[PDB]
A paper describes a structure:
Various light-harvesting antennas bind to the PSI and PSII cores and optimize the capture of solar energy and transfer of excitation energy to the photosystems in oxyphototrophs. In eukaryotes, PSI associates with a distinct set of LHC subunits (LHCIs) to form the PSI-LHCI supercomplex, whose three-dimensional (3D) architecture has been resolved in multiple species by cryo–electron microscopy (cryo-EM). Euglena is a genus of secondary endosymbiotic eukaryotes that acquired chloroplasts through secondary endosymbiosis with a green alga.
In this study, we determined the cryo-EM structure of PSI-LHCI from E. gracilis strain Z at a 2.82-Å resolution using single-particle analysis. The structure reveals a PSI-monomer core and 13 LHCI subunits. The eight core subunits are PsaA, PsaB, PsaC, PsaD, PsaE, PsaF, PsaJ, and PsaM in the E. gracilis PSI-LHCI. Compared with the structures of PSI supercomplexes from land plants and green algae, the E. gracilis PSI lacks PsaG, PsaH, PsaI, PsaK, PsaL, PsaN, and PsaO. Thus, the E. gracilis PSI-LHCI does not have the inner belt of LHCIs formed at the side of PsaF and PsaJ in most green-lineage organisms. LHCI-3 engages in unique pigment-pigment and pigment-protein interactions with PsaJ.
Author numbering:
A (entry chain J): 1 to 37
B (entry chain F): 168 to 333
C (entry chain B): 368 to 441
D (entry chain B): 515 to 588
E (entry chain A): 11 to 751
F (entry chain C): 2 to 81
G (entry chain D): 316 to 504
The structure:
């Protein structure tokens, strides 16, 4: 590892990671507090 | 309070009909399994959640139609006068805060990298420290918005904006 | 009843496209900017990007939300 | 049900308008072709250069808008 | 000697540097982005190795190493299937009651209400019913435990790592030279005798020693818990002797050429097992062992290092007749210097093989209990048909890339390839006529029937009760295949399948297989098939033969394989490239396969699949194909409208995901028309107004928004069309056949 | 026939001339630019309308411009 | 100096003309080939086939009734080149002549002559041939290739403005002119 973090900084990796976290957060909220209308 | 010809879900018979119809389906599915087995437990969890959900809708002042399904009120005056602001009006404020935040973070990062040597390299390789700093400093985004607006730093002047032969 | 409603709305639809078509043919063949300088036609042409971008917003807003709500309900 | 379809119709009216208004307001020229008035209302394109220019004439905006109009009256 | 391993040590340094420099592989892409077009170009050009370098050795090395990566991803995918089968399935339940329990190996998590998709599939299990045939394949192998499935899934993950290793090793550490890659005779000898020969021998070994006992015991109702483990058949020969007594003679018959002593596990019965409805595994063993012998033999035919064997270049150059000039001269150089030529031939064959697989696996069901799993049968037919169609269209693509990029006139003077190109107007024009003729005399017959039906003249229709068109050759062939066991395949007991004629094979109540009869309806659909395949060849072949030039554009090759047009002059030249022919052939392959899989689904549901009571067979759609398929209205009414009830009435049930996928696919298909029917002139001018508003609020991006290219618009259009069409049929097929059958 | 016109923004790079597949354009001497040559279009009866020249031109809004017009057998690119 | 060349001087070489006619002929009808094969024994079958030398990409009836094109050049060696009408041919050492049906095919072959050979061939001349027998010399029209500036050439269809300084169509309505042809220097027909 000397340029591996720069690879992780590229747009599709950062996108996959960000969506995964944002999705995970919404899933976990919809586990704890379901059926908000 | 019944408005617009709608009944409250708490005192609607069609609402109960719907709950019965969902619970009956789950009972039919349970007949196939054995009272201790794990599919059985899954169907019980499903039924519990279902009854809980209808109970919640009942004690929320939701308003049912003739179909027996809850209906939302979107005029703000009607919503606030009859206690339905949680259906659309609060979510409005909630969406507009988060959308303003995302915009502000994005505009900020773009205005920051635009002063670099190759600004387009910082669009396909994200400056992650810079992006996290911007993401967390942007929680008070109306500060920046109203400052930019009132000062005049929000809009580019027309003389500097590329435009076609008109 | 069904036929007459359908007939007239299809005809109205074709006719409203035509009006805009012949509006474009006016702007190409018969509009001269020297004579129409400073009046409402030249002005409307001078802020055409504002018009198109705002319409583009309205379109994107309705499309997203309305297709959203239907897909949620499905 | 009436609320959703009325917003669908709104989407169709605005989107048809946007295609036709762009047609009429970009008729005389754009950035991709600043001299469009010299080619006229209807012409195929301006060739594969400048990134490619299929369907750049005002007639093509009309042609695109007719699909949206049929969908909206639909 | 001559054939030898030759390589280079440590030719490329392992570093994450270039991973952080997108576009590194291209001279142009490596300068960085300025518009959004760059991003798309980066993905479009990544695997095009012959555009990165000119060195064929460097290309060969990249190809070999990429191949290892593909094998690694396949191995992960298989390991997944075994793991899901060991840990989230009802395989052990299904093994006790194959007829009643439905196979399932995907459970869903409870969140947002999706748990409804965990349906009641049997075996005290809730989950999604699978239609891939895994469980039947596992049973045929002899796998009975979840432990065995677990072991297989772990071994496969290690094996996937090893293959990723090999790819890194053979590219970065010890990369073969071009001489190695060019040993095509060594490659053929090894791949025939080793990969296919020994592969068949090994698998016959597994069958004889593991699959045959365990299946034999299981078919006699032996409860899988109290089955012996597979080694027990190897260690204790008394177990396997009770089942097949020939084993008591051991290998002495083999070595004294008294092979008839092994005729109790190496049979030639033919037809289906009456218990499972599959082929007899003793036949399958003899089959694989005979193949082994023929493949090992075949791989001894080319010359490597020992003075025996055929030289391929000679063999090709020898076969030259009078009509054909210099004949097969020059081909050897094409097939050992052009990767694109090889990829073309290999895709055409792989595609044709997938379609043959599909047609042979429905008629001769090879796995136990797969024939009465009608969802599996429909799925596998359809799957393999689509894979085939796609590969064939790829074959055409890569042939045109060869003509544009790797054709040398000098080395092709008056051979076959040159002569082909000297009469390419005669080839296309004759193909054009045949397509018009088949169009009129086949779809014209449906239009005839529809019209005469509507005019109230049903006695004027092309029908079995009217003007008959009987498929008399196919009937002749069917009869001959049914009588074969009496003269022309004397040592065979029963015919290869019930399809040719005879009695209904029925496991429990359900029909495994039964004779498929052909009449007017079968005649019309068959000639529709011949029409749509001919048109697809017309579009693909035109693209290959006119790839370098034409009367319209004399210098097409200089423009290349993929270019949008040569401008609005000469009347307009949109879509002249060979790439644009592959694009239009995708739509015609879609139309062709779609009609074939509709034919299969309706014919099987109407005339084969059903339930038997005593001897009466009650088919799923009650024999409506023979009369109902003779008009377009009947295809719309009795197939599309009627059989679509299951998918549109699936909400609120465990089949509701198919309902959502059905609507979603209609959506994606219609979305594709925005790309196919418009052009980028409009979009680039609309993006100019949007860029205005970003500019005015000082939030315009430095990578300048551009509308997609012409080619990319076409690519997006055909991708979303093919995805939306195929997924629609997938939803409709699975929801129907999972409900009714 | 199509009409090909040259405007005074030409910089005499000769790229259009090189691009043309039916020899319509040539370079003639001029004094309006550093290269001392302008493009010209004598043989526009042979122009097929491909617009390859306009793709080659590097000036901001092209100095060469092809206006499509009436079709002939030459402009329609017909070998019959 | 340079004078306008003649096709007659090129067409004197009867072998090169024979070859040109051989290659610009259409492939025979199946009936005719059947008859040719019918008149020989089996050993002579490839000779019959070797007597055809054309393709389906060559001249049709328009060439006879409207105009054809001729390219001539001289090669230093005998080499295989690619025809713009599909297929391959051999250029001989010395004079080559080839007939085509469009000017674009001629110049395509010319472009190949100037790029794809190691001693580059620069000496091709292209002529247009009418049915009556008039031969018009086409390219290179003045001896110098058109990408090279040559004295004596004049400006054709020059507009002495930028493209933004054209008039509006609405200003020349019912007058019979367009904005693009106003004040054009060297306006050809
Ligand atoms: C585009 C318009 C649209 C809108 C307005 C909605 C709105 C909603 N959906 Mg629907 N939906 C849509 C499209 C849309 N959806 C699509 C396309 C799908 C198919 C994929 C769905 C499928 C779907 C399902 C399956 C479910 C929903 C649910 C919901 C409810 C969300 C409850 C929630 O999680 O809030 C809580 C989330 C937050 C409060 C966000 C927190 C963000 C930060 C931490 C707060 C910061 C504030 C300061 C909400 C009414 C759920 C529901 O229960 O509805 C009754 C639900 O189960 N949606
Ligand atoms: C966008 C269009 C729109 C429309 C058609 C309406 C229509 C209406 N509003 Mg609403 N309203 C809106 C937006 C809109 N509102 C907005 C943007 C606000 C500020 C957030 C309000 C705040 C509001 C108040 C405070 C009241 C209404 C009320 C009403 C009712 C008016 C009755 C009357 O005139 O006496 C009528 C249904 C009145 C009502 O009857 O509510 C109970 C009322 O008191 N509106
Ligand atoms: C900083 C990001 C940013 C900001 C502040 C804006 C702001 C705006 N956009 Mg733009 N847009 C953006 C990104 C952005 N956009 C991107 C990435 C795209 C390509 C998909 C577009 C495509 C687009 C179109 C087609 C249109 C707009 C329009 C608009 C205007 C009206 C609001 C709207 O339509 O939202 C809609 C926004 C979208 C459809 C894009 C989603 C933007 C994402 C969700 C946020 C930014 C993502 C970015 C990667 C964040 C990285 C930040 C991090 C590194 C710190 C408003 C000025 C409309 C307009 O012109 O109004 C007059 C209009 O038609 N935008
Ligand atoms: C009073 C109404 C009216 C009038 C007087 C005009 C007049 C004109 N229009 Mg306008 N236009 C109109 C309404 C009108 N239009 C409408 C409603 C639309 C929207 C559809 C348009 C859209 C339009 C466009 C896009 C264009 C014009 C153009 C023109 C001009 C030339 C038309 C031409 O050459 O036709 C001759 C055309 C035909 C003979 C083609 C007929 C096509 C038929 C009708 C298709 C029908 C299908 C089939 C036959 C149905 C049969 C049933 C089936 C079962 C067999 C002319 C000035 C053109 C122009 O040149 O301006 C530059 C131009 O490009 N018009
Ligand atoms: C179902 C078919 C279909 C759909 C969905 C669209 C959608 C659109 N059209 Mg297109 N169009 C179509 C057919 C369609 N068109 C056809 C047949 C033609 C004739 C050629 C056109 C011609 C046309 C023109 C000329 C124009 C449009 C425009 C639009 C945009 C209007 C904006 C809007 O309404 O909502 C917003 C967007 C949507 C509703 C679609 C987004 C889809 C989902 C919501 C996005 C989420 C995806 C999800 C996360 C999964 C990701 C995928 C995954 C694999 C990664 C929208 C993108 C106009 C436009 O761009 O104005 C700005 C415009 O000018 N259309
Ligand atoms: C008997 C010797 C032998 C065998 C079994 C193979 C087998 C294979 N080679 Mg071939 N190859 C060989 C000799 C052999 N090769 C020789 C001598 C040459 C040089 C002339 C080549 C040159 C060659 C190239 C250039 C390529 C292959 C590729 C392949 C793979 C094709 C895909 C496949 O069907 O996977 C089926 C998978 C299996 C059967 C699992 C195999 C597991 C191990 C490796 C088997 C070892 C047997 C063990 C000792 C018992 C396959 C793994 C292709 C490939 O995919 O490379 C990565 C490829 O691109 N081979
Ligand atoms: C063994 C099979 C095989 C191999 C090794 C190749 C190899 C190649 N192909 Mg060939 N080809 C094949 C089969 C194959 N092809 C098939 C089956 C077809 C018909 C579809 C083609 C048609 C074809 C064309 C038309 C072209 C190539 C080209 C190429 C080259 C570059 C590919 C590239 O960079 O794309 C990078 C990969 C992508 C951009 C991925 C695209 C993703 C697709 C569009 C969608 C996949 C959908 C997915 C399955 C499901 C939905 C996903 C979900 C998110 C919704 C490369 C040499 C190109 C070339 O010119 O090289 C000279 C080229 O133009 N191929
Ligand atoms: C239903 C839609 C449709 C129809 C009818 C056609 C029809 C045709 N396509 Mg097109 N095509 C289509 C959609 C369609 N296409 C689409 C969506 C695309 C993708 C973009 C294409 C892309 C495409 C390509 C790339 C090609 C075709 C070709 C063809 C022609 C095939 C030859 C033929 O069968 O002629 C026979 C005509 C028909 C079958 C049409 C119906 C004729 C009816 C039944 C007869 C009419 C009544 C008549 C007056 C009766 C006389 C006899 C009676 C009195 C006894 C045919 C005209 C091919 C072609 O031209 O090759 C020769 C070709 O190469 N098509
Ligand atoms: C089919 C009969 C066949 O292939 O005969 C074979 C015949 C040529 O055979 P030859 O005896 O020249 O030699 C063929 C090989 O030995 C070399 O390629 O094919 C053709 O002449 C092409 C005919 C296309 C006619 C289209 C119909
Ligand atoms: C409600 C109501 C009312 C009122 C009414 C109103 C207010 C109305 C309005 C209306 C309107 C307000 C309408 C409108 C419409 C519009 C349109 C429809 C438009 C169009 C246009 C166009 C298409 C154009 C074109 C053009 C162009 C593009 C260019 C130039 C030329 C021209 C101009 C031609 C009352 C009180 C009586 C009663 C109660 C109810
Ligand atoms: S593909 Fe587009 S740019 Fe090219 S000729 Fe056709 S319309 Fe014109
Ligand atoms: S359009 Fe084509 S033929 Fe005409 S001048 Fe330009 S390059 Fe030459
Ligand atoms: S017209 Fe354009 S391409 Fe031609 S010489 Fe002038 S500048 Fe160069």
């Amino acid at each position: 590892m000397k340029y591996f973090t720069t690879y992780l900084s590229t747009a599709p990796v950062v996108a996959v990671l960000w969506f995964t976290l944002t999705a995970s957060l919404l899933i976990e909220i919809n586990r704890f507090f379901p059926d908000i209308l | 309070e019944a408005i617009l010809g709608l009944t409250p879900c708490a005192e609607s018979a069609k609402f109960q009909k719907v709950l019965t119809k969902e619970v009956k389906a789950l009972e039919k599915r349970e007949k196939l399994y054995e009272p201790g087995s794990a599919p059985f437990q899954a169907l019980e969890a499903t039924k519990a959640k279902t009854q809980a959900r209808f109970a919640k809708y009942a004690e929320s002042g939701l308003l049912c139609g003739a179909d027996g399904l809850p209906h939302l009120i979107s005029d703000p005056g009607l919503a606030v006068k009859y206690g339905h602001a949680g259906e659309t009006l609060i979510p409005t404020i909630g969406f507009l805060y988060v959308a303003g935040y995302i915009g502000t973070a994005g505009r900020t990062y773009l205005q920051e990298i635009s002063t670099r040597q190759k600004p387009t390299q910082s669009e396909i390789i994200i400056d992650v420290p810079l992006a996290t700093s911007i993401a967390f400093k942007s929680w008070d985004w109306p500060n920046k918005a109203v400052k930019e607006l009132a000062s005049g730093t929000l809009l580019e002047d027309a003389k500097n904006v590329p435009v076609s032969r008109r | 009843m069904a036929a007459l409603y359908t007939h007239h709305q299809y005809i109205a639809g074709f006719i409203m496209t035509g009006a805009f078509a012949h509006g474009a043919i006016f702007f190409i063949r018969d509009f001269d900017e020297e004579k129409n300088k400073g009046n409402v036609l030249s002005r409307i042409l001078d802020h055409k990007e504002a018009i198109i971008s705002h319409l583009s917003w309205v379109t994107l807003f309705l499309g997203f939300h309305t297709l959203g709500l239907y897909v949620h309900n499905d | 049900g009436d609320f959703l379809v009325h917003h669908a119709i709104a989407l169709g009216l605005h989107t048809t308008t946007l295609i036709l208004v762009k047609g009429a307001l970009d008729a005389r020229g754009s950035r991709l072709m600043p001299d469009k008035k010299d080619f006229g209302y209807s012409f195929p394109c301006d060739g594969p250069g400048r990134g490619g220019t299929c369907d750049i004439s005002a007639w093509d905006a009309f042609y695109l808008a007719v699909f949206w109009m049929l969908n909206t009256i639909g | 000697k001559r054939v030898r391993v030759a390589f280079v040590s440590n030719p490329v340094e392992t570093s994450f540097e270039k991973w952080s420099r997108p576009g590194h592989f291209s001279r142009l892409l490596s300068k960085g982005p300025n518009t959004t077009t760059w991003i798309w170009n980066l993905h479009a050009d990544a695997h095009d190795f012959d555009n990165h370098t000119t060195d064929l050795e460097d290309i060969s090395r990249k190809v070999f190493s990429a191949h290892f990566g593909q094998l690694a991803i396949i191995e992960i995918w298989l390991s997944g299937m075994f793991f899901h089968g060991a840990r989230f399935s009802n395989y052990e339940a299904w093994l006790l009651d194959p007829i009643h329990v439905k196979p399932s190996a995907q459970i869903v998590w409870p969140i947002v209400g999706q748990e409804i998709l965990n349906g009641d599939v049997g075996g005290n299990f809730q989950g999604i019913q699978i239609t891939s045939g895994l469980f039947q394949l596992w049973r045929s192998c002899g796998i009975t435990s979840e432990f065995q499935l677990y072991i297989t899934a772990l071994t496969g993950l290690i094996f996937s790592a090893v293959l990723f290793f090999a790819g890194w090793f053979h590219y970065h550490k010890a990369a073969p030279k071009l001489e190695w890659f060019q040993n095509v005779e060594s490659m053929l000898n090894h791949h025939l005798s080793g990969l296919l020969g020994l592969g068949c021998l090994s698998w016959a070994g597994h069958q004889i020693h593991v699959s045959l006992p365990i299946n034999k015991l299981l078919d006699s109702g032996v409860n899988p818990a109290e089955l012996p483990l597979p080694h027990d058949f190897i260690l204790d020969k008394s177990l396997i002797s009770q089942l097949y007594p020939s084993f008591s003679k051991g290998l002495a018959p083999f070595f004294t050429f008294h092979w008839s002593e092994y005729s109790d596990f190496l049979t030639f019965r033919g037809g289906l097992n009456n218990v499972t409805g599959g082929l007899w595994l003793t036949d399958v063993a003899h089959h694989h062992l005979a193949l082994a012998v023929l493949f090992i033999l075949a791989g001894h035919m080319y010359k490597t290092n020992w003075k025996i064997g055929h030289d391929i270049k000679g063999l090709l150059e020898s076969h030259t007749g009078p009509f054909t000039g210099q004949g097969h001269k020059g081909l050897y150089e094409i097939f050992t210097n052009s990767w694109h030529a090889q990829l073309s031939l290999n895709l055409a064959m792989m595609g044709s093989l997938s379609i043959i697989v599909a047609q042979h696996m429905y008629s001769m069901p090879p796995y136990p209990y797969i024939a009465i799993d009608y969802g599996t049968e429909l799925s596998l037919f359809t799957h393999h048909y689509w894979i085939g169609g796609f590969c064939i269209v790829g074959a055409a693509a890569h042939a045109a890339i060869f003509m544009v990029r790797d054709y040398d006139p000098a080395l092709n003077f008056n051979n076959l390839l040159d002569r082909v190109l000297l009469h390419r107007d005669a080839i296309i024009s004759h193909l054009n006529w045949v397509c018009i003729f088949l169009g009129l005399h086949s779809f014209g017959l449906y239009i005839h029937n529809d019209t005469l039906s509507a005019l109230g003249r049903p006695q004027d229709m092309f029908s079995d009760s009217a003007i008959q068109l009987q498929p008399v050759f196919a009937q002749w062939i069917q009869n001959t295949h049914y009588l074969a066991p009496t003269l022309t395949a004397f040592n065979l007991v029963s015919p290869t399948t019930p399809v040719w004629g005879g009695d209904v094979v029925s496991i429990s109540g359900k029909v495994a297989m039964m004779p498929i009869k052909l009449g007017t309806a079968d005649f019309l659909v068959h000639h529709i098939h011949a029409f749509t395949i001919h048109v697809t060849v017309l579009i693909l072949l035109k693209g290959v033969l006119f790839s370098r030039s034409s009367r319209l554009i004399p210098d097409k090759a200089s423009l290349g394989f993929r270019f949008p047009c040569d401008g609005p002059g000469r009347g307009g030249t949109c879509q002249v490239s060979a790439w644009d022919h592959v694009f239009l052939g995708l739509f015609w392959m879609y139309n062709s396969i779609s009609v074939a899989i509709f034919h299969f689904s309706w014919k099987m549901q109407s005339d084969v699949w059903g339930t038997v009571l005593a001897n009466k067979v009650s088919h799923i759609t009650g024999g409506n194909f023979s009369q109902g398929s003779l008009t377009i209205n009947g295809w719309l009414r009795d197939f599309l409208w009627a059989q679509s009830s299951q998918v549109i009435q699936s909400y609120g049930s465990p089949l509701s995901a198919y309902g959502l996928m059905f609507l979603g696919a209609h959506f994606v298909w219609a979305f594709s028309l925005m790309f196919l029917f418009s052009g980028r002139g409009y979009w680039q001018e609309l993006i100019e107004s949007i860029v205005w508003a970003h500019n005015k609020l000082k939030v315009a991006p430095n990578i300048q928004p551009r509308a997609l290219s012409i080619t990319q618009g076409r690519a997006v259009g055909v991708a979303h069309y093919l995805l939306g069409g195929i997924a629609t049929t997938w939803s409709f097929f699975l929801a129907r056949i999972i409900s009714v059958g | 026939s199509h009409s090909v016109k040259i405007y005074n923004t030409c910089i005499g790079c000769t790229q259009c001339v090189r691009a043309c597949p039916t020899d319509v354009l040539e370079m003639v001497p001029w004094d309006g630019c550093k290269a001392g040559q302008i493009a010209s279009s004598p043989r526009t009866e042979d122009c097929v309308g491909c617009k390859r020249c306009e793709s080659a031109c590097p000036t901001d809004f092209l100095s060469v411009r092809v206006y499509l017009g009436s079709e002939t057998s030459r402009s329609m690119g017909l070998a019959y | 100096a340079w004078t306008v060349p003649d096709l007659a001087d090129a067409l004197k070489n009867t072998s090169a003309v024979a070859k040109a006619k051989g290659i610009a002929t259409q492939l025979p009808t199946f009936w005719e080939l059947r008859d040719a094969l019918s008149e020989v024994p089996k050993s002579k079958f490839p000779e019959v086939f070797a007597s055809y030398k054309g393709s389906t990409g060559t001249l049709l009836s328009a060439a006879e009734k409207e105009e054809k094109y001729v390219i001539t050049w001289t090669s230093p060696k005998k080499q295989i080149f690619e025809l713009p009408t599909g297929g391959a041919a051999e250029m001989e050492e010395g004079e080559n002549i080839f007939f085509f049906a469009r000017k674009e095919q001629c110049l395509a072959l010319g472009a190949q002559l100037r790029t794809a050979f190691k001693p580059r061939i620069e000496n091709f001349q292209i002529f247009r041939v009418f049915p009556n027998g008039e031969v018009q010399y086409l390219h290179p029209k003045d001896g110098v290739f058109p990408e090279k500036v040559n004295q004596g050439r004049t400006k054709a269809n020059h507009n002495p403005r930028s493209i933004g300084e054209n008039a509006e169509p609405a200003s020349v309505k019912f007058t019979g002119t367009t904005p693009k042809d106003v004040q054009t220097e060297g306006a050809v027909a």
